[PDB]
Amino acid sequence: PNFSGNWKIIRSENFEELLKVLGVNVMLRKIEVAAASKPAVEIKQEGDTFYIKTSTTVRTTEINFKVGEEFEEQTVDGRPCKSLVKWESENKMVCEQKLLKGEGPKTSWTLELTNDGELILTMTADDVVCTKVYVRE
Ligand SMILES: [Cl-]
Ligand SMILES: [Cl-]
C-alpha cells in the first residue's frame, strides 16, 4: 500500500481529551482544536522512507523518517522526542517516542492505510487514544 498523497480529514475522536490528559491548558487546547479542524496532510512515501507534512493555521510540521531508523520530532503536546517507526503489518506502522529531556506519559502514534483507501491515525498517551481518519484527495 502506498501512503503517498494529499489527505483530508473526515473523522476525529478524542483529540481534545488526549491533550487534556497530557496537561495542556484549556486555552491552548481550544486553539489546537481550532487548528485541527482544517488540516492538510501530505505524504510522500518511497519504500520505507517517508516525508509527512501536516499544515494547519497554527503551524506546519514536516517529518522525514525511514522505518527502523531513529529520528527526532515532537510529541503531540510539543515536547522534543526521539521516535522510531516500525511496521506492524504491510498496511500499518507504529511509532514509539522517547523524550529528549525529562519524563512524561508514554506517547505513541500509528498510521494505517485500509483496504478501502482510508488513512487512520491514532495517537496515544498512556491509556487515552485519539483517532483521526482521512481520505485521499
Ligand atoms: Cl504523522
Ligand atoms: Cl505538534
Residue 72: CB partners within 8 Å, gap ≥ 6?
80, 81, 82, 83, 100
Sequence-ordered list of residues with C-beta below 8 angstroms from that of 83, at least 6 positions apart, any chain: 65, 70, 71, 72, 73, 95, 96, 97, 98
| Adjacent-strand bridge partners of 16 | none
93 C-alpha to center of ligand 2: Å?
19
Answer for the pair 135, 12: CB distance below 8 angstroms, yes or no: no
Q: Comparing C-alpha atoms, which of 124, 98, 125, 100 is closest to residue 111?
A: 124
- C-beta pairs of 52-58 under 8 Å, 24+ apart in sequence: 58/31, 58/32, 58/34
Q: Give which of 108, 26, 112, 53 is closest to 75, Cα–Cα.
A: 108
* Candidate CATH numbers 2.60.120.1130, 3.30.160.110, 2.40.128.20, 3.30.565.10; the one for domain 1-137: 2.40.128.20
Indicate the burial class of 120 (C-beta count within 10 angstroms; 0-12, 13-18, 19 or more). Answer: middle
Q: Which long-range contacts (CB under 8 A, 24 or more apart) does 35-39 make?
A: 35/59, 36/12, 39/8, 39/9
62 CA from centroid of ligand 2 (Å):
10
CA 88 to chain centre: 16
Q: How was this structure determined?
A: X-ray
Ligand sitting nearest the alpha carbon of 62: 1
Q: How far is Cα 108 from Cα 115, in angstroms, rounded to an integer?
A: 23
Dist. CA 98 → ligand 1 center (Å): 16
